[PDB]
CSV table of C-alpha atoms and ligand atoms in Angstrom, one decimal:
chain,number,residue,atom,x,y,z
L,69,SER,CA,-73.7,235.5,41.6
L,70,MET,CA,-72.5,238.3,39.4
L,71,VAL,CA,-70.0,236.0,37.6
L,72,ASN,CA,-71.1,232.4,38.0
L,73,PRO,CA,-74.0,231.0,35.9
L,74,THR,CA,-76.9,229.3,37.6
L,75,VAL,CA,-78.4,226.2,35.9
L,76,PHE,CA,-81.4,224.1,36.9
L,77,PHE,CA,-82.5,220.5,36.6
L,78,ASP,CA,-86.1,219.5,37.0
L,79,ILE,CA,-85.9,216.0,38.4
L,80,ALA,CA,-88.5,213.4,37.6
L,81,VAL,CA,-89.2,210.0,39.1
L,82,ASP,CA,-90.7,207.6,36.5
L,83,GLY,CA,-91.7,210.7,34.7
L,84,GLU,CA,-93.4,212.4,37.6
L,85,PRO,CA,-91.9,215.8,38.8
L,86,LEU,CA,-90.0,215.6,42.0
L,87,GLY,CA,-88.6,219.1,42.1
L,88,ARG,CA,-86.0,221.5,40.9
L,89,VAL,CA,-82.3,221.5,41.8
L,90,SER,CA,-80.3,224.6,40.8
L,91,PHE,CA,-76.5,224.8,40.7
L,92,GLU,CA,-74.0,227.6,40.9
L,93,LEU,CA,-71.3,226.8,38.4
L,94,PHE,CA,-67.9,228.1,39.4
L,95,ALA,CA,-66.9,229.7,36.1
L,96,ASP,CA,-64.8,232.2,38.1
L,97,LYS,CA,-62.4,229.4,39.2
L,98,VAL,CA,-63.1,226.5,36.8
L,99,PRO,CA,-64.2,228.2,33.6
L,100,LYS,CA,-63.8,225.4,31.0
L,101,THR,CA,-65.5,222.8,33.1
L,102,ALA,CA,-68.3,225.1,34.2
L,103,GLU,CA,-68.9,226.2,30.6
L,104,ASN,CA,-69.3,222.6,29.5
L,105,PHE,CA,-71.9,221.9,32.1
L,106,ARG,CA,-73.7,225.2,31.4
L,107,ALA,CA,-73.9,224.4,27.7
L,108,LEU,CA,-75.0,220.8,28.2
L,109,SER,CA,-77.7,222.1,30.6
L,110,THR,CA,-79.1,224.5,27.9
L,111,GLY,CA,-78.7,222.1,25.0
L,112,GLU,CA,-77.4,225.0,22.9
L,113,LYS,CA,-74.9,222.8,21.1
L,114,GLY,CA,-77.6,220.4,19.9
L,115,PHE,CA,-77.1,217.8,22.7
L,116,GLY,CA,-77.0,217.7,26.4
L,117,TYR,CA,-78.5,216.5,29.7
L,118,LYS,CA,-82.2,216.9,29.0
L,119,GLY,CA,-83.9,213.5,29.2
L,120,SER,CA,-80.8,211.7,30.7
L,121,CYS,CA,-80.9,209.5,33.9
L,122,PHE,CA,-79.2,209.5,37.3
L,123,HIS,CA,-78.0,206.0,36.8
L,124,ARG,CA,-76.0,205.5,40.0
L,125,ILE,CA,-77.4,206.8,43.4
L,126,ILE,CA,-75.6,205.6,46.5
L,127,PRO,CA,-77.0,206.9,49.8
L,128,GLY,CA,-74.4,208.5,52.0
L,129,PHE,CA,-72.1,209.3,49.0
L,130,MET,CA,-73.4,210.7,45.7
L,131,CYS,CA,-75.9,210.9,42.9
L,132,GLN,CA,-74.3,210.4,39.5
L,133,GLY,CA,-75.7,211.1,36.0
L,134,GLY,CA,-75.1,212.7,32.7
L,135,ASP,CA,-74.8,209.8,30.1
L,136,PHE,CA,-76.9,211.2,27.2
L,137,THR,CA,-75.1,209.2,24.4
L,138,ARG,CA,-75.1,205.6,25.5
L,139,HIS,CA,-77.9,206.0,28.1
L,140,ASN,CA,-76.3,203.2,30.2
L,141,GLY,CA,-73.6,204.8,32.4
L,142,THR,CA,-70.7,204.2,30.1
L,143,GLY,CA,-71.1,207.2,27.8
L,144,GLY,CA,-71.1,210.9,27.6
L,145,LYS,CA,-69.4,213.7,25.7
L,146,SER,CA,-68.3,217.2,26.3
L,147,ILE,CA,-68.8,220.3,24.2
L,148,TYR,CA,-65.0,220.0,23.4
L,149,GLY,CA,-65.0,216.5,22.1
L,150,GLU,CA,-65.5,213.1,23.7
L,151,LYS,CA,-63.1,213.9,26.5
L,152,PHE,CA,-61.3,217.0,28.0
L,153,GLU,CA,-58.4,217.4,30.4
L,154,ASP,CA,-58.7,217.9,34.2
L,155,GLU,CA,-58.7,221.7,34.3
L,156,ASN,CA,-57.6,222.2,37.9
L,157,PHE,CA,-58.0,220.8,41.4
L,158,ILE,CA,-58.5,224.1,43.2
L,159,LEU,CA,-61.8,223.0,44.8
L,160,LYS,CA,-62.3,220.0,47.0
L,161,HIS,CA,-65.1,217.6,47.8
L,162,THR,CA,-66.0,219.4,51.0
L,163,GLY,CA,-69.5,218.2,51.7
L,164,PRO,CA,-73.1,217.8,50.5
L,165,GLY,CA,-74.1,219.6,47.4
L,166,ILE,CA,-70.6,219.7,45.7
L,167,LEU,CA,-70.9,219.2,42.0
L,168,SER,CA,-68.0,217.4,40.4
L,169,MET,CA,-67.0,215.6,37.2
L,170,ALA,CA,-67.2,211.8,36.9
L,171,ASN,CA,-64.3,210.2,35.0
L,172,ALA,CA,-62.5,207.1,34.0
L,173,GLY,CA,-59.0,208.3,35.2
L,174,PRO,CA,-56.9,211.3,34.3
L,175,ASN,CA,-58.1,213.7,31.6
L,176,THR,CA,-61.3,211.8,30.7
L,177,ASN,CA,-64.0,214.4,31.5
L,178,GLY,CA,-67.0,214.1,29.3
L,179,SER,CA,-70.5,214.9,30.5
L,180,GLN,CA,-71.0,212.5,33.5
L,181,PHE,CA,-71.0,214.3,36.8
L,182,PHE,CA,-72.0,213.6,40.4
L,183,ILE,CA,-73.6,215.5,43.3
L,184,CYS,CA,-72.1,214.7,46.7
L,185,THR,CA,-74.4,214.0,49.6
L,186,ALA,CA,-71.4,213.9,52.0
L,187,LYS,CA,-67.8,214.9,52.1
L,188,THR,CA,-65.9,212.6,49.7
L,189,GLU,CA,-62.3,213.8,50.3
L,190,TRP,CA,-60.7,210.7,48.7
L,191,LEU,CA,-61.8,212.1,45.3
L,192,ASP,CA,-59.9,215.3,45.8
L,193,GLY,CA,-57.2,215.8,43.2
L,194,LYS,CA,-58.8,213.1,41.0
L,195,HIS,CA,-62.2,214.6,40.1
L,196,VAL,CA,-62.7,218.2,39.1
L,197,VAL,CA,-65.1,220.1,41.4
L,198,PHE,CA,-66.8,222.9,39.5
L,199,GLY,CA,-70.1,223.8,41.1
L,200,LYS,CA,-72.5,223.4,44.0
L,201,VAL,CA,-76.2,223.0,44.6
L,202,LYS,CA,-77.7,226.4,45.1
L,203,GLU,CA,-81.4,225.5,45.8
L,204,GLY,CA,-83.1,222.2,46.0
L,205,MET,CA,-80.7,220.2,48.3
L,206,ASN,CA,-83.9,218.7,49.7
L,207,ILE,CA,-84.7,217.4,46.2
L,208,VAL,CA,-81.2,215.8,46.1
L,209,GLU,CA,-81.8,214.2,49.5
L,210,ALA,CA,-85.1,212.9,48.1
L,211,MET,CA,-83.3,211.4,45.1
L,212,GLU,CA,-80.8,209.7,47.4
L,213,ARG,CA,-83.6,207.6,48.9
L,214,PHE,CA,-84.2,205.9,45.5
L,215,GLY,CA,-80.7,204.5,45.5
L,216,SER,CA,-79.1,201.5,47.0
L,217,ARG,CA,-75.7,200.1,48.2
L,218,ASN,CA,-74.6,199.3,44.7
L,219,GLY,CA,-76.1,202.4,43.1
L,220,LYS,CA,-79.0,200.8,41.3
L,221,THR,CA,-82.1,202.9,41.6
L,222,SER,CA,-85.6,201.5,42.4
L,223,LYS,CA,-87.3,204.0,40.1
L,224,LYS,CA,-86.0,205.8,37.1
L,225,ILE,CA,-84.6,209.2,38.1
L,226,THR,CA,-84.3,211.6,35.1
L,227,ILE,CA,-83.6,215.2,34.2
L,228,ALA,CA,-87.0,216.0,32.7
L,229,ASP,CA,-85.9,219.6,31.9
L,230,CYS,CA,-82.9,221.7,32.3
L,231,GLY,CA,-81.6,225.1,31.4
L,232,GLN,CA,-79.9,228.3,32.6
L,233,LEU,CA,-81.5,230.7,35.1
L,234,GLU,CA,-81.1,234.4,36.0
C,176,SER,CA,-72.5,166.1,52.1
C,177,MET,CA,-72.8,169.9,51.9
C,178,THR,CA,-70.2,172.7,52.3
C,179,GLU,CA,-70.1,176.4,51.4
C,180,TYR,CA,-67.4,178.5,49.8
C,181,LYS,CA,-66.9,182.3,49.7
C,182,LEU,CA,-65.5,183.0,46.2
C,183,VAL,CA,-64.3,186.5,45.2
C,184,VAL,CA,-63.9,187.6,41.6
C,185,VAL,CA,-61.2,190.3,41.1
C,186,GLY,CA,-59.3,191.8,38.2
C,187,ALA,CA,-59.1,195.0,36.1
C,188,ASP,CA,-62.1,196.9,34.9
C,189,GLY,CA,-63.9,195.5,31.8
C,190,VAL,CA,-62.2,192.0,31.8
C,191,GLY,CA,-65.5,190.1,32.2
C,192,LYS,CA,-65.8,189.5,35.9
C,193,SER,CA,-69.5,190.2,35.9
C,194,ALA,CA,-70.2,188.4,32.6
C,195,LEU,CA,-68.5,185.3,33.9
C,196,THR,CA,-70.5,185.4,37.1
C,197,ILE,CA,-73.8,186.1,35.3
C,198,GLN,CA,-73.2,183.2,33.0
C,199,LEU,CA,-72.7,180.9,36.0
C,200,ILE,CA,-75.7,182.3,38.0
C,201,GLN,CA,-78.2,183.2,35.3
C,202,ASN,CA,-77.0,181.3,32.2
C,203,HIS,CA,-77.0,184.3,29.8
C,204,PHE,CA,-74.3,186.5,28.4
C,205,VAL,CA,-74.6,190.3,29.0
C,206,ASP,CA,-73.4,192.1,26.0
C,207,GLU,CA,-73.9,195.6,27.4
C,208,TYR,CA,-71.3,196.9,29.9
C,209,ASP,CA,-72.8,197.6,33.3
C,210,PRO,CA,-70.0,198.7,35.5
C,211,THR,CA,-69.9,197.0,38.9
C,212,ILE,CA,-69.9,198.7,42.3
C,213,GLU,CA,-70.5,195.4,44.2
C,214,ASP,CA,-72.8,192.4,43.7
C,215,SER,CA,-73.3,189.1,45.5
C,216,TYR,CA,-74.8,185.8,44.3
C,217,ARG,CA,-75.5,182.4,45.7
C,218,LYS,CA,-75.8,179.1,43.8
C,219,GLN,CA,-76.0,175.5,44.8
C,220,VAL,CA,-73.8,173.2,42.7
C,221,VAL,CA,-72.3,169.7,42.8
C,222,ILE,CA,-68.5,169.5,42.3
C,223,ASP,CA,-66.7,166.1,42.3
C,224,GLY,CA,-69.8,164.5,43.8
C,225,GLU,CA,-69.8,167.0,46.7
C,226,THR,CA,-72.7,169.4,47.0
C,227,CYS,CA,-71.8,173.0,47.9
C,228,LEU,CA,-73.2,176.5,48.1
C,229,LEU,CA,-71.2,179.1,46.2
C,230,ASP,CA,-71.3,182.6,47.7
C,231,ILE,CA,-69.8,184.7,44.9
C,232,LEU,CA,-68.7,188.3,45.4
C,233,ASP,CA,-68.4,190.2,42.1
C,234,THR,CA,-66.1,193.1,42.8
C,235,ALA,CA,-65.4,196.3,40.8
C,236,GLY,CA,-62.2,196.5,38.8
C,237,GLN,CA,-60.5,199.4,40.5
C,238,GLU,CA,-57.4,200.1,42.6
C,239,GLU,CA,-59.0,202.8,44.8
C,240,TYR,CA,-60.6,201.9,48.2
C,241,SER,CA,-57.8,199.6,49.5
C,242,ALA,CA,-59.4,199.2,52.9
C,243,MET,CA,-62.8,198.1,51.5
C,244,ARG,CA,-61.1,195.8,49.1
C,245,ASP,CA,-59.0,194.3,51.9
C,246,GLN,CA,-62.2,193.4,53.8
C,247,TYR,CA,-63.4,191.4,50.7
C,248,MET,CA,-60.1,189.6,50.7
C,249,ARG,CA,-60.1,188.8,54.4
C,250,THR,CA,-63.5,187.1,54.1
C,251,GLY,CA,-62.9,185.4,50.8
C,252,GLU,CA,-61.7,181.8,50.7
C,253,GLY,CA,-60.7,181.7,47.1
C,254,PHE,CA,-60.1,184.2,44.4
C,255,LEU,CA,-60.7,184.2,40.6
C,256,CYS,CA,-58.1,186.5,39.2
C,257,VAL,CA,-59.4,187.6,35.8
C,258,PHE,CA,-57.7,189.3,32.9
C,259,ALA,CA,-58.8,189.7,29.3
C,260,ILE,CA,-56.7,188.0,26.6
C,261,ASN,CA,-57.0,191.2,24.5
C,262,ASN,CA,-56.0,193.6,27.3
C,263,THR,CA,-52.3,193.5,28.1
C,264,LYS,CA,-52.6,196.0,31.0
C,265,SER,CA,-55.2,193.7,32.7
C,266,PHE,CA,-52.6,190.9,32.5
C,267,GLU,CA,-49.9,193.1,33.9
C,268,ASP,CA,-52.2,194.0,36.8
C,269,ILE,CA,-52.6,190.3,37.9
C,270,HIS,CA,-49.4,190.3,40.0
C,271,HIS,CA,-50.8,193.3,42.0
C,272,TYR,CA,-54.0,191.4,42.8
C,273,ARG,CA,-51.9,188.4,44.0
C,274,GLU,CA,-49.7,190.6,46.1
C,275,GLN,CA,-52.7,192.2,47.8
C,276,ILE,CA,-54.4,188.8,48.4
C,277,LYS,CA,-51.2,187.4,50.0
C,278,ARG,CA,-50.7,190.4,52.2
C,279,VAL,CA,-54.3,190.5,53.4
C,280,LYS,CA,-54.5,186.7,54.0
C,281,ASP,CA,-51.0,186.8,55.5
C,282,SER,CA,-50.0,183.8,53.5
C,283,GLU,CA,-48.2,182.8,50.3
C,284,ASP,CA,-50.6,179.8,49.8
C,285,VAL,CA,-54.1,181.2,49.0
C,286,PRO,CA,-56.6,179.4,46.8
C,287,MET,CA,-56.6,181.2,43.5
C,288,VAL,CA,-57.2,180.6,39.8
C,289,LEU,CA,-55.9,182.7,36.9
C,290,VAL,CA,-58.6,183.3,34.3
C,291,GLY,CA,-57.9,184.5,30.8
C,292,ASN,CA,-61.3,185.7,29.6
C,293,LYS,CA,-62.6,186.8,26.2
C,294,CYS,CA,-61.0,183.9,24.3
C,295,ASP,CA,-63.7,184.1,21.6
C,296,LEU,CA,-62.3,187.4,20.3
C,297,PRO,CA,-59.8,187.8,17.4
C,298,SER,CA,-57.8,190.6,19.0
C,299,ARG,CA,-55.6,188.6,21.4
C,300,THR,CA,-52.6,190.5,22.9
C,301,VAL,CA,-51.6,188.0,25.7
C,302,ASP,CA,-50.2,184.7,24.6
C,303,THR,CA,-51.5,181.5,26.3
C,304,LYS,CA,-47.9,180.5,27.1
C,305,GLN,CA,-47.3,183.8,28.9
C,306,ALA,CA,-50.3,183.2,31.1
C,307,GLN,CA,-49.5,179.5,31.7
C,308,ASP,CA,-45.9,180.6,32.7
C,309,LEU,CA,-47.3,183.1,35.2
C,310,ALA,CA,-49.7,180.6,36.7
C,311,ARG,CA,-46.9,178.0,37.0
C,312,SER,CA,-44.7,180.5,38.8
C,313,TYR,CA,-47.6,181.0,41.3
C,314,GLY,CA,-48.4,177.3,41.6
C,315,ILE,CA,-52.0,177.9,40.5
C,316,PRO,CA,-54.3,176.8,37.7
C,317,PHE,CA,-54.8,178.8,34.5
C,318,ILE,CA,-58.2,178.5,32.7
C,319,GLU,CA,-59.1,180.2,29.4
C,320,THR,CA,-62.7,181.3,29.3
C,321,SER,CA,-65.3,183.1,27.2
C,322,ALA,CA,-68.3,184.5,29.0
C,323,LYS,CA,-69.9,185.0,25.6
C,324,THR,CA,-69.8,181.4,24.4
C,325,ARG,CA,-69.7,180.0,28.0
C,326,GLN,CA,-66.4,178.1,27.3
C,327,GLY,CA,-64.6,177.4,30.5
C,328,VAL,CA,-67.1,179.2,32.8
C,329,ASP,CA,-68.0,176.2,35.0
C,330,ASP,CA,-64.4,175.0,34.9
C,331,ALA,CA,-63.1,178.3,36.3
C,332,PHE,CA,-65.4,178.3,39.3
C,333,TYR,CA,-65.2,174.6,39.9
C,334,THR,CA,-61.4,174.6,39.7
C,335,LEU,CA,-61.3,177.4,42.3
C,336,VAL,CA,-63.5,175.2,44.6
C,337,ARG,CA,-61.0,172.3,44.1
C,338,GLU,CA,-58.2,174.7,45.1
C,339,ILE,CA,-60.0,175.6,48.3
C,340,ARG,CA,-60.6,172.0,49.1
C,341,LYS,CA,-57.0,171.1,48.5
C,342,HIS,CA,-55.9,174.0,50.7
C,343,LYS,CA,-58.2,172.9,53.5
C,344,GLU,CA,-56.6,169.4,53.4
C,345,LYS,CA,-53.1,170.8,54.3
H,617,GNP,N1,-66.6,189.0,23.4
H,617,GNP,C1,-66.6,188.9,24.8
H,617,GNP,N2,-67.0,190.0,25.4
H,617,GNP,C2,-67.0,189.8,26.8
H,617,GNP,C3,-66.6,188.7,27.5
H,617,GNP,N3,-66.7,188.9,28.8
H,617,GNP,C4,-67.2,190.1,28.9
H,617,GNP,N4,-67.3,190.7,27.7
H,617,GNP,C5,-67.8,192.1,27.5
H,617,GNP,O1,-66.9,193.0,28.1
H,617,GNP,C6,-67.5,194.1,28.7
H,617,GNP,C7,-67.2,194.2,30.1
H,617,GNP,O2,-67.7,193.0,30.8
H,617,GNP,P1,-68.0,193.0,32.4
H,617,GNP,O3,-68.3,191.5,32.7
H,617,GNP,O4,-68.9,194.0,32.7
H,617,GNP,O5,-66.5,193.4,32.9
H,617,GNP,P2,-66.1,193.6,34.5
H,617,GNP,O6,-64.8,193.0,34.6
H,617,GNP,O7,-67.2,193.1,35.3
H,617,GNP,N5,-66.1,195.3,34.6
H,617,GNP,P3,-66.1,196.1,36.1
H,617,GNP,O8,-64.7,195.9,36.7
H,617,GNP,O9,-66.3,197.6,35.7
H,617,GNP,O10,-67.2,195.7,36.9
H,617,GNP,C8,-69.0,193.9,28.4
H,617,GNP,O11,-69.4,194.6,27.2
H,617,GNP,C9,-69.1,192.4,28.2
H,617,GNP,O12,-70.2,192.0,27.3
H,617,GNP,C10,-66.2,187.6,26.7
H,617,GNP,O13,-65.8,186.5,27.2
H,617,GNP,N6,-66.2,187.8,25.4
H,618,MG,MG1,-68.4,194.0,36.8
C-alpha cells in the first residue's frame, strides 16, 4: 500500500517460531485505531505487543490476543490511555483475516484485538475493524489448531517479535 | 438411590459464577479473573440422603448470542441466577435472566435460586431485603454466598437441587 502501514508478528509456540503474519492496517479509513496498533507493534511508546500471548483461540471463529499489561486476558492499554472510543464502523467482519478490536462494550478499545478465521457478522457495528492479514494466513490457520471450544490453548502462543515493515 | 441434575449458572459478567462453581468442584477460590466462554463440570454429591450427579454448566455473563444461550436454557433443569452484592447493575439484570428462562422453558414455574455473591466484601450496594423481596416475588429461594470464604456455596447448589426435586413432584 502507498498509504496503509504494514506490521508483522512473528508467532511462537512455546517459544518455537511458527511463522510470520503481516497485516495491512487501514489507516486510510480508520486512522486512530490503525495508528494505535501500529505503535503497539513497534513498541515505540515504550510498551506494546512484543512478548504477549494469544490467550483465546476458538477454531472456526477467531484468534484473540494483545493483553500486555495483566498478561491474563483482562488487560491492555492503548497509546491514548487505558481506553479509546469506537472510531467508526465503516468496515465489517467479512471473512477470514479481518483484524478487529476486542472490547468490553461501547468505547472500551485498548490493545486487545482479534483475527477472524471466518465471517463474524454479528460483531459488525460493535467491534471496530481496522486491518487485515496480508501474508501468513496459513500461520493464522496453524494457530487456530492450538485452540479449543472454550478458547483455551493447548500450547502457549505468543508474539515473539513484532514491528513495522516496508 | 441415584439421580442426575443439569444445573446452569447464569448472571452478569464478573459476579462470581465461575468462582462459585470452582469452589464446589475443586474446593479452592480463584482470585484472578479468567473470563468464561463455556465450561462444564460433573460431581457426585449426597443431598438429603439422596445421591446424585450434578452436571454444572458455567456460562458466560453476556447478553449476546441469544440462540446459543436459549439452548443452554432448554437443556437445563435448574438455574442459579447470580448477582454480586456490590454490583447494582448485576442485580437489575436478574429479571432479564428470569424472563429468558421462562420464555425458553415455556413455563412460569422453573427451578431457580437467586444467589447474592461476594458477601465477604465491604462495598455492598444491594441490600439483603431488596434481594429477599425480589426472590419472594418470584417464589424462589435467595442465598447469600461468598466464593472467597466458601460461605453458602454448597447451600446454593443443594438448594437448587431441592427446587428441581420439588418441581418434579408436581
Ligand atoms: N471477594 C470476592 N471476590 C469474588 C467472589 N466471587 C468471585 N470473585 C472475584 O470476582 C472476579 C470475577 O469472578 P468470576 O467467578 O470469574 O466471575 P464470572 O461471573 O464467572 N465472570 P464471566 O461472566 O466473565 O465468566 C474474580 O476476580 C473473582 O476472584 C467472592 O465471593 N468474593
Ligand atoms: Mg465465569
